[PDB]
Amino acid sequence: ISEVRGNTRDHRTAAHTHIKGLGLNSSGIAEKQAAGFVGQCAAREACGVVVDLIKAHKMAGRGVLLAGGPGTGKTALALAISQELGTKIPFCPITGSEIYSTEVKKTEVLMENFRRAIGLRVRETKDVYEGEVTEMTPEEAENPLGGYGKTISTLLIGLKSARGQKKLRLDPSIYEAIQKERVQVGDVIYIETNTGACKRVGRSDAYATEFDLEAEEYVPIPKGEVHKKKEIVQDVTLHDLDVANARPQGGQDIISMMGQLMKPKMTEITDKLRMEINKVVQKYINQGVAELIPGVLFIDEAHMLDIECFTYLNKALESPIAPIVVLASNRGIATIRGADDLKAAHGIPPDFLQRLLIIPTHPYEPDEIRRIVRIRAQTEGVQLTDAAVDRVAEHGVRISLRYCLQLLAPASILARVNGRTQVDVQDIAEAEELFLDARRSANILTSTGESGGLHGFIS
Amino acid sequence: HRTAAHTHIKGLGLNSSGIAEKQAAGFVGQCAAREACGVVVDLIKAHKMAGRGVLLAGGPGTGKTALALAISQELGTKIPFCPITGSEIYSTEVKKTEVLMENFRRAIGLRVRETKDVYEGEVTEMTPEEAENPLGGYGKTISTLLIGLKSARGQKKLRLDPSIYEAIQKERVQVGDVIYIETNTGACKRVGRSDAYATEFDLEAEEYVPIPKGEVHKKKEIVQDVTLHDLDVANARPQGGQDIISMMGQLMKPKMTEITDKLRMEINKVVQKYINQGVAELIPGVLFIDEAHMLDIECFTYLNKALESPIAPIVVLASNRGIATIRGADDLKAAHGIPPDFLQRLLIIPTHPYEPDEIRRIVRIRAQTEGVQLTDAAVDRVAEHGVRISLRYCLQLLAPASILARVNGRTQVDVQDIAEAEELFLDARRSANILTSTGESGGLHGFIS
Amino acid sequence: LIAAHSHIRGLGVDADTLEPRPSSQGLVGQEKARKAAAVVLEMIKQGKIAGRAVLIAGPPSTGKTAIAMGMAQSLGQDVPFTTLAASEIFSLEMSKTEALTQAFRKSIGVRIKEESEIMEGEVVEIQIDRSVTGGAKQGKLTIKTTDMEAIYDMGSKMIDAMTKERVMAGDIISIDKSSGKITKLGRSYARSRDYDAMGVDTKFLQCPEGELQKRKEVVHTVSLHEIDVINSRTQGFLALFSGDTGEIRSEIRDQINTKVAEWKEEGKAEIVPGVLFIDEVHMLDIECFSYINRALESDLAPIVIMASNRGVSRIRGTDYKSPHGLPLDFLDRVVIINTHPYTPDELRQILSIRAQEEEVDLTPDALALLTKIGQEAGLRYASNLITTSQLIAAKRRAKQVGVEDVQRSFKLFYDPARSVRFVQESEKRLIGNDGVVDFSY
Amino acid sequence: KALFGPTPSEIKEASFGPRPVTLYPPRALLPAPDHDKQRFTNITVPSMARFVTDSGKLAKLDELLRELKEGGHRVLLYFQMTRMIDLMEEYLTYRNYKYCRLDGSTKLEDRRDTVADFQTRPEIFIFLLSTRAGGLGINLTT
Amino acid sequence: KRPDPMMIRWVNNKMGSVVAVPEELLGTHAGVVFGAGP
Numbered sequence A: 001i002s003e004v005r006g007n008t009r010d011h012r013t014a015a016h017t018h019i020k021g022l023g024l025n026s027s028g029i030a031e032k033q034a035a036g037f038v039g040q041c042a043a044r045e046a047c048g049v050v051v052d053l054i055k056a057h058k059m060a061g062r063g064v065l066l067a068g069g070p071g072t073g074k075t076a077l078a079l080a081i082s083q084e085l086g087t088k089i090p091f092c093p094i095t096g097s098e099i100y101s102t103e104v105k106k107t108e109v110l111m112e113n114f115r116r117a118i119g120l121r122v123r124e125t126k127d128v129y130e131g132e133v134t135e136m137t138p139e140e141a142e143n144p145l146g147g148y149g150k151t152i153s154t155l156l157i158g159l160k161s162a163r164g165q166k167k168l169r170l171d172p173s174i175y176e177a178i179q180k181e182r183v184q185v186g187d188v189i190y191i192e193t194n195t196g197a198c199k200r201v202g203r204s205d206a207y208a209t210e211f212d213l214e215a216e217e218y219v220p221i222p223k224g225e226v227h228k229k230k231e232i233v234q235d236v237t238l239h240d241l242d243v244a245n246a247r248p249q250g251g252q253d254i255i256s257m258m259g260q261l262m263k264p265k266m267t268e269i270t271d272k273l274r275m276e277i278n279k280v281v282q283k284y285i286n287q288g289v290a291e292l293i294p295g296v297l298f299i300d301e302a303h304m305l306d307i308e309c310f311t312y313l314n315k316a317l318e319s320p321i322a323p324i325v326v327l328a329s330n331r332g333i334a335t336i337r338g339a340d341d342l343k344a345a346h347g348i349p350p351d352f353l354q355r356l357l358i359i360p361t362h363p364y365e366p367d368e369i370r371r372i373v374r375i376r377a378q379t380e381g382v383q384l385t386d387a388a389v390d391r392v393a394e395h396g397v398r399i400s401l402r403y404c405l406q407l408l409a410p411a412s413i414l415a416r417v418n419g420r421t422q423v424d425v426q427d428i429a430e431a432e433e434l435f436l437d438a439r440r441s442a443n444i445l446t447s448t449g450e451s452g453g454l455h456g457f458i459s
Numbered sequence B: 001h002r003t004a005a006h007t008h009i010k011g012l013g014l015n016s017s018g019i020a021e022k023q024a025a026g027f028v029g030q031c032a033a034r035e036a037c038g039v040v041v042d043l044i045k046a047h048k049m050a051g052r053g054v055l056l057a058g059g060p061g062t063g064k065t066a067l068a069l070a071i072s073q074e075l076g077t078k079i080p081f082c083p084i085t086g087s088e089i090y091s092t093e094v095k096k097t098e099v100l101m102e103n104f105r106r107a108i109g110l111r112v113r114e115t116k117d118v119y120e121g122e123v124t125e126m127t128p129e130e131a132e133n134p135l136g137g138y139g140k141t142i143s144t145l146l147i148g149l150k151s152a153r154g155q156k157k158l159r160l161d162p163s164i165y166e167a168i169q170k171e172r173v174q175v176g177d178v179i180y181i182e183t184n185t186g187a188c189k190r191v192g193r194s195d196a197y198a199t200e201f202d203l204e205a206e207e208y209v210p211i212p213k214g215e216v217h218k219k220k221e222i223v224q225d226v227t228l229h230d231l232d233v234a235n236a237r238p239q240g241g242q243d244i245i246s247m248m249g250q251l252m253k254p255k256m257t258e259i260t261d262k263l264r265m266e267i268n269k270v271v272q273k274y275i276n277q278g279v280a281e282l283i284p285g286v287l288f289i290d291e292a293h294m295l296d297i298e299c300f301t302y303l304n305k306a307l308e309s310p311i312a313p314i315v316v317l318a319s320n321r322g323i324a325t326i327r328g329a330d331d332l333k334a335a336h337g338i339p340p341d342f343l344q345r346l347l348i349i350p351t352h353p354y355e356p357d358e359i360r361r362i363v364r365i366r367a368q369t370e371g372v373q374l375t376d377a378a379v380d381r382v383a384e385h386g387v388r389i390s391l392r393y394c395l396q397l398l399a400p401a402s403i404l405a406r407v408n409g410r411t412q413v414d415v416q417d418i419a420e421a422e423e424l425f426l427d428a429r430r431s432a433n434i435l436t437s438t439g440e441s442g443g444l445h446g447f448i449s
Numbered sequence C: 001l002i003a004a005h006s007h008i009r010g011l012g013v014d015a016d017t018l019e020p021r022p023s024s025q026g027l028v029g030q031e032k033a034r035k036a037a038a039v040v041l042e043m044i045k046q047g048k049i050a051g052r053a054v055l056i057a058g059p060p061s062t063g064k065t066a067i068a069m070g071m072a073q074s075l076g077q078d079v080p081f082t083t084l085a086a087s088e089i090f091s092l093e094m095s096k097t098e099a100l101t102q103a104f105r106k107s108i109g110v111r112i113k114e115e116s117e118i119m120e121g122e123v124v125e126i127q128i129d130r131s132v133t134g135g136a137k138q139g140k141l142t143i144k145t146t147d148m149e150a151i152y153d154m155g156s157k158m159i160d161a162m163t164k165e166r167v168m169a170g171d172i173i174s175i176d177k178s179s180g181k182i183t184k185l186g187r188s189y190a191r192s193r194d195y196d197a198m199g200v201d202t203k204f205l206q207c208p209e210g211e212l213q214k215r216k217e218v219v220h221t222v223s224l225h226e227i228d229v230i231n232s233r234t235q236g237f238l239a240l241f242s243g244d245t246g247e248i249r250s251e252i253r254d255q256i257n258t259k260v261a262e263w264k265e266e267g268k269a270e271i272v273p274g275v276l277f278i279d280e281v282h283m284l285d286i287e288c289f290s291y292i293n294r295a296l297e298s299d300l301a302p303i304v305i306m307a308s309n310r311g312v313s314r315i316r317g318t319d320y321k322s323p324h325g326l327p328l329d330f331l332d333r334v335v336i337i338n339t340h341p342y343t344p345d346e347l348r349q350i351l352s353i354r355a356q357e358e359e360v361d362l363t364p365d366a367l368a369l370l371t372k373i374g375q376e377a378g379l380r381y382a383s384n385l386i387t388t389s390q391l392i393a394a395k396r397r398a399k400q401v402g403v404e405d406v407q408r409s410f411k412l413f414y415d416p417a418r419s420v421r422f423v424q425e426s427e428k429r430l431i432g433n434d435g436v437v438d439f440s441y
Numbered sequence D: 001k002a003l004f005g006p007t008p009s010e011i012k013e014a015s016f017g018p019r020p021v022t023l024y025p026p027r028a029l030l031p032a033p034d035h036d037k038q039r040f041t042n043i044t045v046p047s048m049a050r051f052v053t054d055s056g057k058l059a060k061l062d063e064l065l066r067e068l069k070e071g072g073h074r075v076l077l078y079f080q081m082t083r084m085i086d087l088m089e090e091y092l093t094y095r096n097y098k099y100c101r102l103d104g105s106t107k108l109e110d111r112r113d114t115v116a117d118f119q120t121r122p123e124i125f126i127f128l129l130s131t132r133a134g135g136l137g138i139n140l141t142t
Numbered sequence E: 001k002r003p004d005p006m007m008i009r010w011v012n013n014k015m016g017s018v019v020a021v022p023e024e025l026l027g028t029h030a031g032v033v034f035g036a037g038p
């Protein structure tokens, strides 16, 4: 049906594709450049302890602040933390701007993400019989019931898979499932042993040629064993348990079915539900059938949170089940987003800041900027003459790190369209002239928009 | 049983002449205000008036809310007393002027005679009859049900319309059940099984009930108390029919709606029929808007028209504020926080601070109300607060002091237990000093500004 | 997990004298405030008095939440203790007034008793009849003790339960006849061999003895709010949990208040009034305070406890300041508890409890240094360094947290005051309140 | 039709047909009521527990008869009103108490029989008994 | 009493279980599962 593309796979490169980890010794000391990082040895070592905090299940509701100017690698450090944890531990990134939902109060939006950052791992065994129905045969009973004339003591079903077939002897009550489900010979079904009922996947595509037209799609014969008994490990967040309880999905009545045909509007999940969910979760943890695996809620531009968000986070972080929260901020001393009379450092209320482990991120030396240019070039696949490297690094000292990382691809285009397989000073000197930085542009504004005028900028 | 701020207030404590006894029904003083509240009770009990406004005006803790709750007791249970704060008016579902109208009509009551015309019996037969419709695609439809009802002194066979069969069906009625049917609403209730065949061995946990005594068909009469707002809500969210709109209207989430003047006017016509039919007594009541300074200039400008309505309750406002900015009208200051052209509409009952001997009396009334047996030196101690501190701070100390005395093994509170209560539990002013002295400079241990 | 207050296991007072011990049940110091909270706790338990507002006041830290969490532990599970952050009240689904009304009514329990009746026996036989093409079902259960056999008729709801539970002969089952729930307790017979897919060979049990029916007195506690939600509705009682409930009409509450009183007079219910704890109470608006002040005055009002960090501070929604940021005519109705910042030996004792709760073996000099840090950086920061130094010690395989680990932790992680200096030392490179910044070296 | 489901003749036709047929809708799509006892109406039925507790005399009598029954104390109840001894046996038949009745409306041979019945067999627990018609002459020494 | 025309009956006991089918359903589609269709 679909025409599979045989062409080679490759990965897009984004602003942080070069970062692969925190780059630490087994002693936890930062290597001066490793895993894509250059410098920030203090902040990487601190994040390494935070990583070991998260992997140790004693933590609940601790707070971290990544504090430092724009460009200083706070986003890179958060992503590196996430990569050090890996996919088995939740990392839930948001900005403060995402909390201003129109659809529920923002303390609900934040508590959703707070519970998204908390994972639950449940182990259960799946136990089914599974195949194409090869036969159905009633076993007439030894002692029939009077007045009925028919009495069946067993129904026998043949199931085949790709890997075998079995004669299956079933309690005759399965007649109810077969008759409702309209199971026929050549249909693919499974029998689940916790009910003894059956469900029909479809007709086996071995029968796809029975007619010139039949109104169903066929399905392949199951490629497993005819009997499955498997442990299954389910990734669950506690937010999944919130929604699954607060809006049940499978309801067969008109109001349920009309509900599932209309937009699944968020609702202000009660603390009573969440607190009972916690109690049943803690029960199953004590049974040992589930693991709690708290992860990371990361809030970037946390200075976009307002004082109502921060005061709720006080209560939230005090929960006995809670992720770690990592905050990033760049806002100096600034007015609290929802308390116009109050200024504080980082734009974080002094009440709340006292809870956080602050990690400072510092600027970069000229030689670190150069090393970052080397790492970024080989990641985007660009290759530079050393004089192009030094010119890119020089703009990085004079203007900004980000601006210079953004010159690499434009200059690579200009090089290849000039027939050069590597970029040189002539291309950098050309990329930097097509693509201005904010300062040179602001100078054009300041010179041209000194007044109103037919060709003036507008203000 | 539980003791609250006003549990000692029982009434206005007036003489039959309408003069206030200086200490009666739980009050001390406010005599002129209690006498004015008496004349307001007379204005309410005489049904003749609509839309008169009263303002209780006076500083916090002068008993304005005690006066309003005393009115609520002198009126008794029959008359509607509808208390709200001005902060209840800001709904998220409907405009704030809707909430005012709902409260205006909640404050007008109706007592109405109702005849319930019903069938009751053990279901002895139930036999549906149906038609093959033309091809509408939904298939066959039940045209009617035939149902046999047996009572102790008769039986019927009823040929039901199929909308009553849907009531019967959604009530999960079976043969051998005892059921009740209202011809008023078409509604059905399954009362139980018969006490016949009441074998214990059902998992179904049935209530077996006796056969209805009397005839199958009955026409009982009962007296219902309702407000005008109860009628508004019933007719705006219809739910008493067996039609599809009434059916689905029970499955949808309940939500308030901006009931139109058109509906309210036509319910006046309906209720006036009940009056002319002699089946209803109109009993207008009172709306108490506490904290009326929390209303805004749109609320107050609506109240102009609402009070001019040819039926409206009496409105009692209370405010505790001096010359203050009108909310929603930061350009306008007025006394009481009430717009000056609305204040013209009201009769103002000014309410005054208590004297030190009145405070002593209130402390003793309040102590014995809470069951705090309390020595006279201890009374004098508590009553030196209320003079030097708010009156409320006196009354709030009585419960801690009782606990501390009982913990000290005393049968009764001495001055010592109050002097400990004074130390554990500060007034606002002593706490305000702690703030200003500790927050005298910033730091790790400072209070946050 | 270990949370901020997980060591708090009570208020730490002598139940007879209400005298605070200098350290017990995980609380330390605050003796005046702990005694005051113990008198409040006693008048909570006594139930007699309604609508007392108690404000706990103090600087940040100094245990105001810890005291309130100590109170909650001392009440136990039975008395309602509704924690509310004042920022929860600003719902989009309901007004602040309605949100407060629900928070009050969540704090009053109705404790309702019923005589359930239960069956327990071996299933000897099951018969089920099913209408082809659905609709009606019928059946009989034959169920046994050592002493009885009886045959019970079954309806559709019970047959749904029986088939969902996959009840079979030889199962021991119990049936709560009042709710209709079934539980399989085990089996008396072996699991058969004639059929496949029969599932789990559940626990063996001997047959139940005695009579099949037994009465069972059971007691359930429900809030006034939970009675509100199901009585404002025909359908959709999941709004108890999803929070879909709108602004419930006051006619419903007035009826419920009347009927719950009558249920108390009938002896059907006990009212168990509990606590509403409003933390960060300074975050409410003037409109909220002018609701609480009169909501308190009702006979069904809970006891309301509050905490505030604020000094003489602006009231939200208005132009002016007040003590605690709370209106004066509100504070008129409040008795105020003041907490006081800890001494170094109080800091040392708290940090020892935090260390023991986290199971961290501090060396004595590390506890001394953490105390010195506690005096100057703060108790929360000094607490954060305990779990951090434990991790650093584990990197070097140290069996105890040494001074080197606390110094290493102090180096890696800044306290608030040091971070404020770091901000002031980098005002050029951080984003200012003017939005200006310099990105260059 | 969607809410209340397939019609009974349609169920018969579908179940007796030679080949399966899919009904409309094909089931009742009306939800289950959340209140398992109040269902879809606002009609209330007075409980007999409410009948006991809405009289202070009867609430106190109910406790007393319980203790008396466990004591084996066969007991005579005197009423000044005939309508009350009617209501009393509605209560006594809601409970399991075996009772008999004598009042001024019972006919003379019925009075002999009830008096001799109660005085014969200990099975009867409560003699419901009118003050005037039952108060004189008879012997109730058991 | 002769059994209902359309209630198919399942019964389970120590001997295992059986399904019994009304004589009225044999020769209907509901008989096909039992070997007794039209």
Ligand SMILES: Nc1ncnc2c1ncn2[C@@H]1O[C@H](COP(=O)(O)OP(=O)(O)O)[C@@H](O)[C@H]1O
Pocket (backbone or CB within 6 Å): A015, A016, A019, A036, A037, A038, A039, A040, A069, A070, A071, A072, A073, A074, A075, A076, A077, A372, A401, A402, A405
């Ligand atoms: N120490 C570092 N080593 C390598 N790359 C870095 C480092 N710090 C920042 N970068 C890269 O330079 C850019 C600026 O860092 P970023 O984290 O975006 O700054 P901010 O913390 O202000 O968001 C990003 O593309 C990031 O991947």
Ligand SMILES: Nc1ncnc2c1ncn2[C@@H]1O[C@H](COP(=O)(O)OP(=O)(O)O)[C@@H](O)[C@H]1O
Pocket (backbone or CB within 6 Å): B004, B005, B006, B009, B026, B027, B028, B029, B030, B058, B059, B060, B061, B062, B063, B064, B065, B066, B067, B362, B391, B392
């Ligand atoms: N004249 C009075 N006699 C007895 N008790 C009073 C009197 N005035 C006020 N109180 C009591 O003092 C307390 C505060 O009065 P309150 O009515 O709350 O004042 P306001 O409502 O004007 O703030 C209440 O418990 C009230 O019952």
Ligand SMILES: Nc1ncnc2c1ncn2[C@@H]1O[C@H](COP(=O)(O)OP(=O)(O)O)[C@@H](O)[C@H]1O
Pocket (backbone or CB within 6 Å): C004, C005, C006, C008, C026, C027, C028, C029, C030, C059, C060, C061, C062, C063, C064, C065, C066, C067, C350, C353, C379, C380
């Ligand atoms: N007296 C105390 N005893 C034990 N732990 C305390 C005490 N006071 C504060 N703490 C702890 O210090 C931290 C901050 O105290 P907290 O009560 O949250 O302060 P706040 O009153 O500002 O909420 C919490 O982890 C708390 O457990």
Ligand code: ALF
Pocket (backbone or CB within 6 Å): D136, D137, D138
């Ligand atoms: F005097 Al009598 F029965 F008591 F005749």
